[PDB]
Symmetry: D2
Subunit: 386 residues, 4 copies
């Protein structure tokens, strides 16, 4: 019994921001407005970076999908993370989940720390290791559930409760892995629902984009100021392409759910898999939390292969359908070894504590036929452990 699916999601995803009354042509699809400037002083558009129709339409839609009042689009998820951090000042403290996306973790420790920001990496899954790390100078808590790539799950409503009792602290949930179709962090008390739209949101492996949804007025005004002032904004063509991808987010995420579950169950009953981590599986440590907190699950399946890296690498090389590549969340199935690839930027003593061993494989389960996905995992595991 997961959370019941969010009402009107498919309808809002297809229609919010797409009202044909906005355009003199009454086009059913909003036009791509490339114009950098607009004629004045003879609607309310001045300069593309400060706001432009195609981006605004996508922002109105993504907000609705999050159940938020406002949304801001960015040139990437990374740029969305950097813009949020600019909400602070020198002397403030940032608490970050210990297992996050490599670049998020790389940004905080190598860049944000150089500008008077203190950053502490804390296992926020564990209840009051978090409150032990909170001080009166904490201003931002950055959690990511499920985590990348070990997919630890955080009680958002509980973690929000811990966070909001210490004055003004912004809780951010990086919702990249689940999409708002499966999880609505703002409904669970978080202050900011943030996405790398590069993944599931656009869903078509052809747009680098970030998204930031928010309810609080002042938080929005400050974020909105920073969107114009820092200029890390997306192309209107990319905004159009992402809005296009959104129109199928509901049917894609449900197919990701069905294929991901099938893959996860196959891996768990397989004689050559040590362990499977999938929030939809009962064997997941927080599976009951997931069902209370989500309406389903994406196609991110993480597992440990038996043996050493020699077997992990023969497995990847023998895949004929999964593509050995970085990134996730598209229609095509991707496989990757985080020790060498996506989390190679995190140093190894932090790899051993989070669990990113050399046998940890991350799968992005795509929209191909479940038959073909299992058979290629079958054949490729038999070649690795023959």
């Amino acid at each position: 019994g997961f959370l019941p699916h969010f009402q009107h999601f498919a309808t809002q995803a297809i229609h919010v921001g797409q009202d044909p009354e906005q355009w003199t042509s009454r086009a059913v699809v909003p036009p791509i407005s490339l114009s950098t400037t607009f004629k004045q002083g003879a609607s309310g558009f001045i300069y593309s970076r400060l706001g432009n129709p195609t981006r605004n339409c996508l922002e109105k839609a993504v907000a609705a999908l999050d159940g938020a009042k406002y949304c801001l689009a960015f040139a990437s998820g990374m740029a969305a993370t950097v813009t949020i951090t600019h909400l602070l000042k020198a002397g403030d403290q940032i608490i970050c989940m210990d297992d996050v996306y490599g670049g998020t973790n790389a940004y905080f420790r190598q860049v944000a720390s150089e500008f008077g920001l203190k950053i502490s990496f804390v296992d926020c899954s564990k209840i009051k290791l978090l409150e032990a790390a909170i001080t009166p100078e904490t201003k931002l808590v950055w959690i990511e559930t499920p985590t990348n790539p070990t997919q630890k799950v955080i009680d958002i409503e509980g973690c929000a409760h811990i966070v909001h009792k210490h004055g003004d602290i912004i809780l951010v949930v990086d919702n990249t892995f689940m999409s708002p179709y499966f999880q609505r962090p703002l409904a669970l008390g978080a202050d900011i629902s943030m996405y790398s739209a590069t993944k599931y949101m656009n869903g078509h492996s052809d747009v680098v984009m970030g998204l930031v949804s928010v309810n609080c007025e002042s938080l929005h005004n400050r974020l909105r100021f920073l969107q114009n002032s820092l200029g890390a904004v997306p192309s209107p063509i990319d905004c159009y392409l992402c809005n296009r991808g959104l129109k199928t987010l509901h049917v894609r995420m449900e197919r990701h759910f069905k294929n991901g579950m099938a893959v996860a169950q196959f891996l768990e009953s397989n004689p050559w898999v040590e362990k499977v981590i999938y929030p939809g599986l009962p064997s997941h440590p927080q599976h009951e939390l997931v069902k209370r907190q989500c309406t389903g699950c994406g196609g991110m399946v993480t597992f440990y292969i038996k043996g050493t890296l020699q077997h992990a690498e023969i497995f990847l090389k023998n895949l004929k359908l999964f593509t050995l590549a970085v990134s996730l969340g598209g229609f095509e199935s991707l496989a990757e070894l985080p020790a060498s690839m996506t989390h190679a930027s995190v140093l190894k003593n932090d790899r051993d504590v989070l669990g990113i061993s050399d046998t940890l494989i991350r799968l992005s389960v795509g929209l191909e036929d479940e038959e073909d996905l299992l058979e290629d995992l079958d054949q490729a595991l038999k070649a690795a452990h023959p």
Copy 2:
């Protein structure tokens, strides 16, 4: 007697980065690679690097006489990335007349993170030496400035800044384009552009560009490009690279039309003053000819009268469009005190000269005849 034109500019703009042998199809125009990811067994992730963006960066670097070039989601984004080169405790010296957003970012955002910001008239070369501090690591100048178009001796300024310590000198070369000015050849460390303006030139791309020669400076900037992620879309990269192929022939037409407009306006009885680098009446005109191969289409002038006459003039224009931004093929007109520089403080505006009658024009590529008559009829309307 301007500087001689940069050799091979047209040939490099059209061919650098555009080699057909990069692609299996041997296409003469580089394809637009939208793919975010790449199959592994030298591209990893689109934000990290992708063909279409790399071809544009290679081509821009050639136009700047640079070894390296980085592309960004906007001019503003490029500035933010450049400022991320520093650390808490550093000091920044900025031109007192700078693009409003540059002004706003330094004064309202960067100062929040342990960076000291000082606004200094770098046109006067001795106020810069007084401002330079052992904690100064970045000097951000714009020449010509926006919108009063003060001109700075780039080479002389570079001598001052580089004589002691590790200090980066950045020249925002938006108003000129690398076809008319090469800050790196004059001693700047970074040649930066809002490509949204002249570089792309077609009023349909938001983009920034950063060109550099120092290899250690490039390694830090490249790290920040990937780490901060203010990256441009590959399709925008394509369109900008498409715009570049006509930069030489547009900038030449921008020069001819801008000089025509500037000369007309100065002999017009309803105009109190004209500021155009190509005019001998410009305070630094001889410096410009020593520093530049020509001039762009940016003409600013003061209309006679009050804010009322400035408005009547702007509302009677029929070819110039009342709009923000600059550097397109379309002629644009704007009142900076109400529009692009309302973010700048009022008593900073009246010391800068940005009064109620200061008008900035972005002369486009329309027929010179039509542009001159549009200005004539509109000035007559403002002063019946």
Copy 3:
């Protein structure tokens, strides 16, 4: 109990033509090659119109989806039709299904007939009104099942059986309403599987394109010659966008089927609806033939409203989710009155024979929430027929 779903459809739609090894970057998604020309004499590309990477990738993938060896992309579904007709010559005869897309009807009747082509409109569901409409001059049989908009269904294998006994005649099936996820005319004996990719194929209401899939080697060579010779070619960017929509065709069509079924069922038990025409409903005259010929059904639901033209307009003007507009097959629900809009080009006495009356309404059911779609239809019918 429909035909079992075609095997490997999703896998082929996502991967065929999309092999990273084609590109020096090994990009997972093929780049968009705009270049009109290519460097020679240092690649089998000369000039964009004869062929180009982005278009070729799309043609290879569509062919896989059609179970075909070849495919040809065109600037529009209309342009595909025009190109196919150029296969003929002066003196030949064309047999066209009597209920077709308005533009197909008008091109044969107003344009092709002026160039030595004879056009006969025939009910090919009646398997001879077809047989001696065939003459020794018959070179092309053009059918479209289900028809637009009365959605009559033709036995393709049976029709193909008749057509290929009389020598060298080409049977074309406009498979727009079904897409290759639900129906494979080539597997059923047609010579050509033709599409208005503008509809379900692309599915995102932002691309005008036609597709032509074929097996016969000589037939392909003549079509490939004409694609280059007539130049009705699609833009590489449109080729890219259509290939992008193809990646979700299977999940899209499945939701179209479930929503379209629900809309059709709601309408049939509704007291203000005279008659529903939906191939998935047991009430359709060829419902059983459909389940033997197809793996499912699209979102096109046609019905008759009780009353007169006034009620049809009141209903249409009161829809708040369905958009009163032309075309079909996208993610958004559409509604339209063929007599006044899409089939106003076919003559008025030919619409009363086909049943295209002033009360006939055609729905293109999209991918919104079923609940919201049924309540829009409910509310809009009550407005036309209040208590």
Copy 4:
């Protein structure tokens, strides 16, 4: 003394069809409208029906091109070829077509191998020599197709003279393929032609990234028929291509002026080169119709044709030593292209009834530096006869 330049070309190329009042946003650049269909029957609604029938971005482009041709109407097409095919759909079974002896290979092939199979009689006539034409004109002639200058021997046809002759025989259409000159240098309609047709793929777009055709017209009935055939045959261009092509028009005037400047220098350098037998270029006085060119044109494009001395093996080793000129098909871009038509454009024994010998080389002179282009030609000819 060329024709004086057309009077508002640059202004109209930039503003005609670009009016920001068309859009709710007052964007100064027209949005790209992809939408295939448009909402109908709203309160107070008369607009757009279906993208193929017409759409904003295409309409803005057609308005702009028409202004550049001095025409009342323009129609855009998927390709120059599609424009040709659409134009001949104006006829019927039994009509006759007169076509220039030397035309583009595709135009030539379409009439012989396709249009003739549908009750259309095709006669190829040297229309430069005044009176093989009315010797060819019958009461069944309905369309005369000329192309001046020709591809690639660049014969020049008196358009006004040829139009005067043709219009003496009642109902008969004169069509001029204005690809090589562009409306910047030659206006067929002001010279008496009925249709001005382009392969916009070439100079119009001028960026080698768009395949497109254009036909501009003044006569009401000719336009109405042509407009019907546009929607009926559906050989329409993408709105994105329509956008890109209109974007390209904005620099057409400064591009063609640099093409003229570089083409002239290239033609003059080649003619006084010891390894060049003959140069054909309408700008040079040595051209047979140079005086006619100045009477009907405002200048000249960058197409330079010449014969190299020796024959084949020496003709192509010149092409292999070009390192700025690219060996490739097509023309009219910012790029410099070189090509041998006997093997490439007209490899499809009319080789020397046309004069298209084995030693004929066609150059498309780009917008690179004149210095580099001549040095590339000099070096490649020094390598030609070392």
